[PDB]
Design a protein around this ligand. Structure first.
Ligand code: HEM
Ligand code: HEM
Ligand SMILES: Nc1ccc2ccc(CNCCCc3cncc(F)c3)cc2n1
Ligand SMILES: Nc1ccc2ccc(CNCCCc3cncc(F)c3)cc2n1
Ligand SMILES: C[C@H](O)[C@H](O)[C@H]1CNc2nc(N)[nH]c(=O)c2N1
Ligand SMILES: C[C@H](O)[C@H](O)[C@H]1CNc2nc(N)[nH]c(=O)c2N1
Ligand SMILES: [Zn+2]
Lengths: 413, 408
């Protein structure tokens, strides 16, 4: 691979030089003959697979603290090596755990919010042994991160994988999501995205209220055991009623959303160690709710209803009635969050911050891996600066990874 | 292997086998994706390329290994062997041009690919000849508002010093002028080209929408200036169906998008001059040409007239102005009965096209970065469509600006 790759911004003429890509650790899925950049997704480590993975991370950590090659560096390498030799795994120091989590975020090529990567509260939950304990840790995370609306980014890290039959998993895809209910007539109530999971919860004993915005219970698996249900204390779940500054009728649509986006089904990989339960949270970019959650045809799908209330000509597509209503819905989401003083960022501010972030990273780090397909917001693409910015996508470690859904793999006891 | 692409909204899964045909590189490697990077002969090189193309031509008319096929291979072979090049048959030229369109991964309009009027201009020898051919192209393709896709193909490259080139990036474009006060009048994209026309003798009206003259290079000679007869230049005054003040912005655009700076490659042969044209998807003008900061950059002016609050970005005043502008462009073209397609209709057809291509051809190379419209991405079906990008020949390729290589 060439040592220096250039990226250009076509609106500002700024050229950046990437050297960081040489540190790339795994496959994108592309080859020299095909690009899979728009494909969404293109038994434990042996002792021999683990050794170089840990060394690579340890070196990286000690290089970051300006102690590379020090006595403490070499001692730590020695102690890790002996641990792997005698136990076939190793345990991270708290310093290393914190460094690794922050860097997994810093490395997440699909995240537009990474300017914030160094301000991450890390909660070490590696002493957790039961599902009740996972619930306690999760409740504390939710309360801290919510902070009465002044949201603070955070991650809670549960014990790492051992033999793969004792995994800790949060079965929820996010800590807070709304239920979906398939009706006998084919219609869906609530969020169609969560139908499968909702069904699982109901089978496990959950009594469904069967409303349009029912917060799902936690389904929590500890140490490879069967998962257990828990209700999050409603006072810990901050929600925002969606209204519009001009359209008095908008509140009558009865929409609302939850304040805290908290992804809980990803796998955190550090120095070859696998943390299968690592729920993390930041705050929302408005479009995630106003465009995707609300306007996707396979989601709440509200465009028509809003358009009819806006008295739009909906007979031709070329009236852009869909686009017109889409903007108003997004205005409503930002207005409603700001008004209730719940942190949220619009797609202009967020993409402008990311450009500055990217430039700084190129300067101090020699690059910034970025997935343009994900970074460009789902509305108004080209009137945000990221649209015009060439990006290189590659995979650095530590990293957040996808993992199979737990009900697909769980061995029921 | 076989590659699956999934649409996440419809759950439809397609299987790509067509990609096994590509031999050209994408730029990505196993470890680094360059999906958002805008831009990542000899006898010995020539024949296998010629043979490849002749082979797929005869496979497409279902006469592979036929007497005609065999004879054509030997004929081309002899001709390369004796002249360092060869000439395509008319049938092959047409097949080649339609297939370059079909293989253009960045083009959302490909459902039309087999409807392409091909104008063979390989007998052309002078810039005056080129002008005549271009005028006829524009007249044919414009068709009084009922636009028809067309391509005009000039002689292929020989030694690299006798290239035919249309120096204009599109056949019809608006000039751009650098003002004393450091601002730009007209289209800032064309400031450099405009200056070259001026330096060559073009007398600029110095307005906002001055149609540039044609600058045409035949056989490697210096380029020459020509004014396209105005009656051949269809233009649309932009107005809004609700905001009657919109026409007071004085905005207009031309009906015919005719890209003239690309290189058409067929069977190893390079056609450095091949202006082609279709019709507009509305966002090209309403989002990119009008609202790009580096282009006409009108958002702020429009937003003012709409009396929006422009203090905070989170009011989405920009997004609001963007939609109204795009509504106007579509309404104007439609009202003047000039062909145009909105991004909903276009992306819809593209999905149907993909479905067609997978069934009959085994796939469809597609560049999600280009296919997804620059506004309202996820409310169009292509946003939710996984696509595989790969390079098939015949193809349209980029080439350097003539002013950076030409000696006078
Ligand atoms: C602090 C404010 C943050 C903002 C504004 C933000 C913004 C975003 C957005 C808009 C996406 C696209 C998600 C989608 O379309 O589904 C995303 C993806 C992502 N974010 Fe961030 N984020 C933030 C914090 C975080 C944190 C704290 C982490 C981890 C510690 C993180 C890691 C990721 C990852 C791994 C993805 C890719 C998710 C996937 O592939 O499904 N983000 N972010
Ligand atoms: C007939 C109606 C057509 C429509 C609606 C259409 C639509 C589009 C659009 C919107 C783009 C993106 C352009 C940009 O953002 O700069 C594009 C790209 C492209 N189109 Fe089409 N197009 C049409 C006809 C054609 C024809 C007739 C050809 C060639 C014979 C063609 C070949 C291409 C190529 C090569 C690109 C890539 C341009 C580049 O890489 O710079 N298209 N098309
Ligand atoms: N505001 C934030 C911050 C961090 C985030 C991290 C992750 C996410 C959500 N990514 C969800 C995509 C999951 C998915 C996987 N496969 C197919 C899909 F359609 C969707 C949203 C975030 N939002
Ligand atoms: N409606 C159509 C049909 C075919 C088209 C074919 C091409 C185009 C314009 N492509 C623009 C590429 C110019 C460019 C390339 N690389 C970097 C740049 F900054 C600018 C527009 C079309 N519009
Ligand atoms: C097929 C395509 O890759 C898929 O729909 C992607 C496109 N870009 C995205 N970008 C973000 N931020 N989130 C998404 O879910 C998607 N979906
Ligand atoms: C940096 C990025 O590749 C560049 O801005 C691309 C993005 N997608 C595009 N898509 C289209 N249709 N046209 C373009 O000019 C671009 N520009
Ligand atoms: Zn790629």
């Amino acid at each position: 691979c060439p040592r220096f790759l250039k990226v250009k911004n076509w609106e500002t003429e700024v050229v950046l030089t990437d050297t960081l890509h040489l540190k790339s650790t795994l496959e994108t899925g592309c080859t020299e003959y095909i690009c899979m950049g728009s494909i969404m997704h293109p038994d434990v480590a042996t002792k021999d697979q683990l050794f170089p993975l840990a060394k690579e991370f340890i070196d990286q950590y000690y290089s970051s603290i300006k102690r590379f090659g020090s006595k403490a560096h070499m001692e730590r390498l020695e102690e890790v090596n002996k641990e792997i030799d005698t136990t076939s795994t190793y345990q991270l120091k708290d310093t290393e755990l914190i460094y690794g989590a922050k860097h997994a975020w810093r490395n997440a090529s699909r995240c537009v919010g990474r300017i914030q990567w160094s301000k991450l509260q890390v909660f070490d939950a590696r002493d957790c042994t039961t599902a009740h304990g996972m619930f306690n840790y999760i409740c504390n995370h939710v309360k801290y991160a919510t902070n009465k609306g002044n949201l603070r980014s955070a991650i809670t890290i549960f014990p790492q994988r051992t033999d793969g039959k004792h995994d800790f998993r949060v079965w929820n895809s996010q800590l807070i999501r709304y239920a979906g209910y398939k009706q006998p007539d084919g219609s869906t109530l609530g969020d169609p995205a969560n139908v499968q999971f909702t069904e699982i919860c109901i089978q496990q004993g959950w009594k469904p209220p069967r409303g349009r915005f029912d917060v799902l219970p936690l389904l929590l698996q500890a140490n490879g055991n069967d998962p257990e249900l828990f209700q999050i204390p409603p006072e810990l779940v901050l929600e925002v009623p969606i209204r519009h500054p001009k359209f008095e009728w908008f509140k009558d649509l009865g929409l609302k959303w939850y304040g805290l986006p908290a992804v809980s089904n990803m796998l955190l990989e550090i120095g070859g160690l696998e943390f299968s339960a690592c729920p993390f949270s930041g705050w929302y970019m408005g479009t995630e709710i106003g465009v995707r959650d609300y306007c996707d045809n396979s989601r709440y799908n509200i465009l028509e209803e809003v358009a009819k209330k806006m008295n739009l000509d909906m007979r031709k597509t070329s009236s852009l009635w869909k686009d017109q209503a889409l903007v108003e819905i997004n205005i409503a989401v930002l207005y409603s969050f700001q008004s209730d003083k719940v942190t949220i960022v619009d797609h202009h501010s967020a993409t402008e911050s990311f450009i500055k972030h990217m430039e700084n990273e190129y300067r101090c780090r020699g690059g910034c891996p970025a997935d343009w397909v994900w970074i460009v917001p789902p509305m108004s693409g080209s009137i945000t600066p990221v649209f015009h910015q060439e990006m290189l996508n590659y995979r650095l470690t530590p990293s957040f990874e996808y993992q199979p859904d737990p009900w697909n793999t769980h061995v029921w006891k």
